[PDB]
Amino acid sequence: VSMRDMLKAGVHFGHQTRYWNPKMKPFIFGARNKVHIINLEKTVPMFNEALAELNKIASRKGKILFVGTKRAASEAVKDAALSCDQFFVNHRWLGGMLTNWKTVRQSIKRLKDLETQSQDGTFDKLTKKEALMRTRELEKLENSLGGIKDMGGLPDALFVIDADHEHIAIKEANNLGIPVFAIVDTNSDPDGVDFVIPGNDDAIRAVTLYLGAVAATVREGRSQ
RNA sequence: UCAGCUCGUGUUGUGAAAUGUUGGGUUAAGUCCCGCAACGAGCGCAACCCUUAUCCUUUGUUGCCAGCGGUCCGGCCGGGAA
Ligand SMILES: [K+]
Ligand SMILES: [K+]
Ligand SMILES: [Mg+2]
Ligand SMILES: [Mg+2]
Ligand SMILES: [Mg+2]
Ligand SMILES: [Mg+2]
Ligand SMILES: [Mg+2]
Ligand SMILES: [Mg+2]
Ligand SMILES: [Mg+2]
Ligand SMILES: [Mg+2]
Numbered sequence A: 001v002s003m004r005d006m007l008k009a010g011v012h013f014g015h016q017t018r019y020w021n022p023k024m025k026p027f028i029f030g031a032r033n034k035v036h037i038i039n040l041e042k043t044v045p046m047f048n049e050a051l052a053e054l055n056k057i058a059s060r061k062g063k064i065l066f067v068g069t070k071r072a073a074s075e076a077v078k079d080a081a082l083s084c085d086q087f088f089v090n091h092r093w094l095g096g097m098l099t100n101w102k103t104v105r106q107s108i109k110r111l112k113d114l115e116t117q118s119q120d121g122t123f124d125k126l127t128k129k130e131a132l133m134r135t136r137e138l139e140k141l142e143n144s145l146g147g148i149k150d151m152g153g154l155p156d157a158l159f160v161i162d163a164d165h166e167h168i169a170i171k172e173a174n175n176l177g178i179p180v181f182a183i184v185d186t187n188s189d190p191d192g193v194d195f196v197i198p199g200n201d202d203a204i205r206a207v208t209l210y211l212g213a214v215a216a217t218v219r220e221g222r223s224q
Numbered sequence B: 001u002c003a004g005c006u007c008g009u010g011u012u013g014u015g016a017a018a019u020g021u022u023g024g025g026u027u028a029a030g031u032c033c034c035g036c037a038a039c040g041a042g043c044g045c046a047a048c049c050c051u052u053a054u055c056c057u058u059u060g061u062u063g064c065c066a067g068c069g070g071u072c073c074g075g076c077c078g079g080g081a082a
Helices: A003-009 A022-027 A040-059 A074-082 A101-120 A129-145 A167-176 A204-223
Strands: A013-016 A028-031 A035-038 A064-067 A087-089 A157-161 A180-184 A195-198
Touching: A003 A040, A003 A204, A022 A028, A022 A040, A022 A195, A035 A040, A040 A064, A040 A157, A040 A180, A040 A195, A040 A204, A064 A074, A064 A204, A074 A087, A074 A204, A101 A129, A157 A167, A157 A204, A167 A180, A180 A204
Parallel strands: A064 A087, A064 A157, A157 A180, A180 A195
Antiparallel strands: A013 A035, A028 A035
């Protein structure tokens, strides 16, 4: 992607100056109307490198986990992960999804053993109220684990929208050595991210631009 | 007979420990929902047990007497299964 595409989407629009993290100072171009403007001259070469490294991991048959539970990037993280056949978390990240994977697994199993029952017909059997409490455990397990049900283990990379909002996921990945790619706005701390991509993480326009180019370089990375 | 008491893994703290189990509502209830660095699990709560309140089906004596038929007026007798 190029500098003009980032502009029309609003990638260069940061937060108000009073909310900045001073560690973001190198990636800042200036301020306009008391709002920080990210330096797109750095967003481009840093994203391409992130797009380059994501390509290699996909070529080696790696698993990419897309994390974005904000109400702006929620439904797009799921669309980008599917059109790419990888995995995603787009509702509240469960603390310990990765560092406590050996426990969160048993909830993936329960999600499977309860979906085959939705497909079997055991819900037409139960005493109504018992089938109704089981169809509700389904939707809850689906909303939280529906994107990682086939992951079958720790992923090899994480792509995150908003490093601050998903600070727990990033900490879990650093804990296990899993490389973190993340969009980092001006109010966020870039110290945990291995591949920083400074850019607006709130506008739906900019998010889709990030997710499209990443979903592309992994589809191409899985072909070769 | 009060609704409590804990553990595994994870995470936080040099540590004793903490979190979960707190919060917003709700319930007889740590009851349930929602939120949530927690995710799950156990012992308790509830349910499963006995009894009581309504109805059905079967069975009809030592229990029963609606319609019958007699009568010493006693279901007493013949019967009747209501
Ligand atoms: K302390
Ligand atoms: K513990
Ligand atoms: Mg320690
Ligand atoms: Mg207690
Ligand atoms: Mg405690
Ligand atoms: Mg409460
Ligand atoms: Mg309980
Ligand atoms: Mg809680
Ligand atoms: Mg009880
Ligand atoms: Mg008579």
